Amino acid sequence: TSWRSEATFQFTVERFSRLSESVLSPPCFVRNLPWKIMVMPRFHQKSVGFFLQCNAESDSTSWSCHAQAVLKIINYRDDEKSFSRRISHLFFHKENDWGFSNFMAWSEVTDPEKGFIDDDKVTFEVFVQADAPGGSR
């Protein structure tokens, strides 16, 4: 099941408005690699840093995964309004994570009227598709 080429997994960050540091989600396996969502506030204009991390703990320096993904902050009210952005990147030991330091504006995601924050909880979602070595077929 960890050999799959794609997957969609979520990560909820509680007490979000108080977040003053980086938090990391448990791994989700795709192409036998552990993928994670990394979140953190970035700096008077504050923004949400949202990144996709792949196999960062590995000592190995010969692994690589070409992947495209949809980094999305879910909107509890109107899904049509779920905020998402796409990435494409070659993950490997020197660049094991990719995303947006200015994914979205802190004031907007933490606005109780915008639909992204509920009971101070914000949910992140990532749909990732990764390649893998194989024959030409």
Numbering used by the authors: 63 to 105, 111 to 204
Which statements did the authors publish about this structure?
Herpesvirus-associated ubiquitin-specific protease (HAUSP, also known as USP7), a deubiquitylating enzyme of the ubiquitin-specific processing protease family, specifically deubiquitylates both p53 and MDM2, hence playing an important yet enigmatic role in the p53–MDM2 pathway. Here we demonstrate that both p53 and MDM2 specifically recognize the N-terminal tumor necrosis factor–receptor associated factor (TRAF)–like domain of HAUSP in a mutually exclusive manner. The crystal structures of the HAUSP TRAF-like domain in complex with p53 and MDM2 peptides, determined at 2.3-Å and 1.7-Å resolutions, respectively, reveal that the MDM2 peptide recognizes the same surface groove in HAUSP as that recognized by p53 but mediates more extensive interactions. Structure-based sequence alignment of the three HAUSP-binding peptides revealed a conserved four-residue binding motif with the consensus sequence of (Ø/E)-G-(Ø/G)-S, where Ø denotes a non-polar residue.
To facilitate formation of a stable p53–HAUSP complex, we generated a chimeric protein with the C-terminus of the HAUSP TRAF-like domain (residues 53–199) fused to ten amino acids corresponding to p53 residues 359–368. We reasoned that such design would ensure a 1:1 stoichiometry between HAUSP and the p53 peptide. The structure of the HAUSP TRAF-like domain bound to p53 (residues 359–368) was determined at 2.3-Å resolution by molecular replacement. Binding by the p53 peptide does not induce any significant conformational changes in HAUSP as shown by the structural comparison of the free and p53-bound TRAF-like domain. For example, Pro359 and Ser362 in the p53 peptide anchor its interaction with the HAUSP TRAF-like domain; missense mutation of Pro359 or Ser362 in p53 abolished its binding to HAUSP. Mutation of Trp165 and Phe167 in HAUSP, both involved in the hydrophobic pocket that accommodates Pro359 of p53, resulted in a complete loss of binding to p53 (unpublished data). Similarly, mutation of Asp164, which forms hydrogen bonds with S362 of p53, also significantly weakened the ability of HAUSP to bind to p53 (unpublished data). Two non-polar residues, Pro359 in p53 and Ala226 in MDM2, are positioned at the same site upon binding to HAUSP and make similar van der Waals contacts with a hydrophobic-surface pocket near the edge of β-sandwich in HAUSP. The residues following Pro359 in p53 and Ala226 in MDM2 are both glycines, which are very well superimposed and make conserved main-chain hydrogen bonds to Gly166 in the β7 strand of HAUSP. P3, a hydrophobic residue in MDM2 and EBNA1, stacks against a small hydrophobic-surface patch on HAUSP. This residue is Gly in p53, resulting in a loss of van der Waals interaction at the P3 position and consequently contributing to a relatively low binding affinity.
